[PDB]
Amino acid sequence: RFYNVGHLSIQRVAVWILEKYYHDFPVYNPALVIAAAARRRDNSHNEYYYEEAEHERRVRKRRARLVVAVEEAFTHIKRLVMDPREAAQAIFASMARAMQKYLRTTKQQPYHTMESILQHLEFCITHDMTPKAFLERYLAAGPTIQYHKERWLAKQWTLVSEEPVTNGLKDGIVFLLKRQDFSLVVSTKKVPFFKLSEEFVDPKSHKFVMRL
Amino acid sequence: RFYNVGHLSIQRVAVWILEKYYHDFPVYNPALVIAAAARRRDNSHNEYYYEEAEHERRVRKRRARLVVAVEEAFTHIKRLVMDPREAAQAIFASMARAMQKYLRTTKQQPYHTMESILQHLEFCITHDMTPKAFLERYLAAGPTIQYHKERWLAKQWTLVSEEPVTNGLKDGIVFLLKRQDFSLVVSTKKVPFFKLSEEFVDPKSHKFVMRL
Numbered sequence: 003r004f005y006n007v008g009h010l011s012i013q014r015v016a017v018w019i020l021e022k023y024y025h026d027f028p029v030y031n032p033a034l035v036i037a038a039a040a041r042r043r044d045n046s047h048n049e050y051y052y053e054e055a056e057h058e059r060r061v062r063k064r065r066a067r068l069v070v071a072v073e074e075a076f077t078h079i080k081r082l083v084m085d086p087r088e089a090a091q092a093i094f095a096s097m098a099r100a101m102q103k104y105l106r107t108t109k110q111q112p113y114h115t116m117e118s119i120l121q122h123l124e125f126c127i128t129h130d131m132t133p134k135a136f137l138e139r140y141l142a143a144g145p146t147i148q149y150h151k152e153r154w155l156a157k158q159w160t161l162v163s164e165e166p167v168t169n170g171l172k173d174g175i176v177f178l179l180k181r182q183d184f185s186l187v188v189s190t191k192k193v194p195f196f197k198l199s200e201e202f203v204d205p206k207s208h209k210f211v212m213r214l
Numbered sequence: 215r216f217y218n219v220g221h222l223s224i225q226r227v228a229v230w231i232l233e234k235y236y237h238d239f240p241v242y243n244p245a246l247v248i249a250a251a252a253r254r255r256d257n258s259h260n261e262y263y264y265e266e267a268e269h270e271r272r273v274r275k276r277r278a279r280l281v282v283a284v285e286e287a288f289t290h291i292k293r294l295v296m297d298p299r300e301a302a303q304a305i306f307a308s309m310a311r312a313m314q315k316y317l318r319t320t321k322q323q324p325y326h327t328m329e330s331i332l333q334h335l336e337f338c339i340t341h342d343m344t345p346k347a348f349l350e351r352y353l354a355a356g357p358t359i360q361y362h363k364e365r366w367l368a369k370q371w372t373l374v375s376e377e378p379v380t381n382g383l384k385d386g387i388v389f390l391l392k393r394q395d396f397s398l399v400v401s402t403k404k405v406p407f408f409k410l411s412e413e414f415v416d417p418k419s420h421k422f423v424m425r426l
Contacts, residue, residue: 047259047265049261052259053259
């Protein structure tokens, strides 16, 4: 993601980018002579292409199964005795398998526990949220803050900067925001000086003709 | 191919099968712990499937290009001065590239020389044969006698028989008809004894009702 930022020090910029990260980027899912060798590889079976197509196809199939399952599940209850928690638990049975299989095919097992899915079912059916407003949480990757607090690890960011971090940004400052697994590479580019000119066009001067 | 044959000796049966071969089978185109290893292979990328699909797709594409090219080529002349040979040579230019590329993608280069294709163009345009009646020779593999006489090699058949070849056929006689490259395995099975029974049905006795 690209951002615009004013005159902040590199550490304040780091905190700013972290405040942006937990809702901008998708959540980090870790589960997701020489020229002659390159030429030999390029002239081989494009295995990655067909594996990607097959994976996208089976993800679409599991997504369709999940959409149908969640539509049926939410049709298995009416708004009107039974509490929203009991209703979520009663409609989760008709969708637990499809939900689990879609979370497995998209590598989303540790993000969504049965307890969190029940809490979110209760949330949705409490707030008149349709099956699609329920599945918006599970179909896409979603950003970090959407998940459990043990996956945020906000107290474990490291600011790796070639320049001292108390000095503000300038054109070309690159710095890392490292966690245990990934890192945020931040490259700075000064917003260029703009020279606007004013041109006047008469709104009546627009006159068109037939051909081409 | 399966055939029915009467009481012939194995060598006469061999000659009979050879007389059938040159117009029945397609022409021979040569250009066309352990269980753990099998399990490891079966759980790998199905490379042959996607290569076969890609080959069939590019063969269909070259076939479409060739159909269009031959339609245009035959439209480049009228029946009504110019001889059929000169007309074949004049319409071969607008289709030579597509014909060559289709013969390359289907591994049919040595079967069809430019001279034979010109002779067959002359033949077709002489006999009012449409572009599809022209392409029937080139789109499919076609049997052996359809080609040049140097690819028949009828004087180079070897009769490999476990039994003496002067004795007639019986149930289970297997024999080979070997050429330099391939071989015709011939397995004999006696046509079984049939016991017909006669049942009479009244053509007026057919009476039907509504449900199921």
